[PDB]
Amino acid sequence: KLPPGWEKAMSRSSGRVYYFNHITNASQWERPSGEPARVRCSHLLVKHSQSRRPSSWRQEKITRTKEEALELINGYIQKIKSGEEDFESLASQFSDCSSAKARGDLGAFSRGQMQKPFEDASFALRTGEMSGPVFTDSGIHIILRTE
Numbered sequence: 001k002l003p004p005g006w007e008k009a010m011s012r013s014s015g016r017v018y019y020f021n022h023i024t025n026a027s028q029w030e031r032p033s034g035e036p037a038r039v040r041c042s043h044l045l046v047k048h049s050q051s052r053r054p055s056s057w058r059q060e061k062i063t064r065t066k067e068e069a070l071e072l073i074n075g076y077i078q079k080i081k082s083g084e085e086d087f088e089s090l091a092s093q094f095s096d097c098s099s100a101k102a103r104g105d106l107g108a109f110s111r112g113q114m115q116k117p118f119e120d121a122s123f124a125l126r127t128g129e130m131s132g133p134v135f136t137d138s139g140i141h142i143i144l145r146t147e
């Protein structure tokens with residue numbers, strides 16, 4: 001079939017085939033094109049009441065539900081994909097991570113350093129590709145592979 005991690009899917013609303021990556025939670029209409037020692041990523045984190053540390057520079061007590069966090073992530077993904085908003089702008093304004101002040105940049109990293117779902121998505125993204133919602137003990141991430 002297609003590159004590993006990817007599967008064919010059917011749009012429930014249009015009937016048109018699309019492609020879904022179960023490692024990055026990315027989805028796209030085009031058939032996907034197709035590992036490095038290190039990747040560089042940015043991310044936009046939305047925490048929730050069950051986050052390992054439910055606090056952030058935005059909010060001393062994060063109280064939103066996981067469902068509310070996922071809805072916020074979904075909305076940010078929509079605006080990034082439509083081009084109304086840039087990833088970096090939304091990360092700076094709304095990421096519950098200290099990296100928000102760096103437009104979400106986390107720098108480069110190897111396997112072994114980040115939380116596993118984040119690492120797997122990061123290394124499965126192509127350069128310049130953005131993830132779907134990625135879930136970790138920290139909360140819910142939108143990941144952008146920059147290198």
Ligand SMILES: Cc1nccn1-c1ccccc1N
Nearest residue numbers: 048066067069070135139140
């Ligand atoms: C995938 C999903 N849909 C609604 C809520 N969540 C969710 C959010 C955070 C952690 C786990 C889960 N299941």
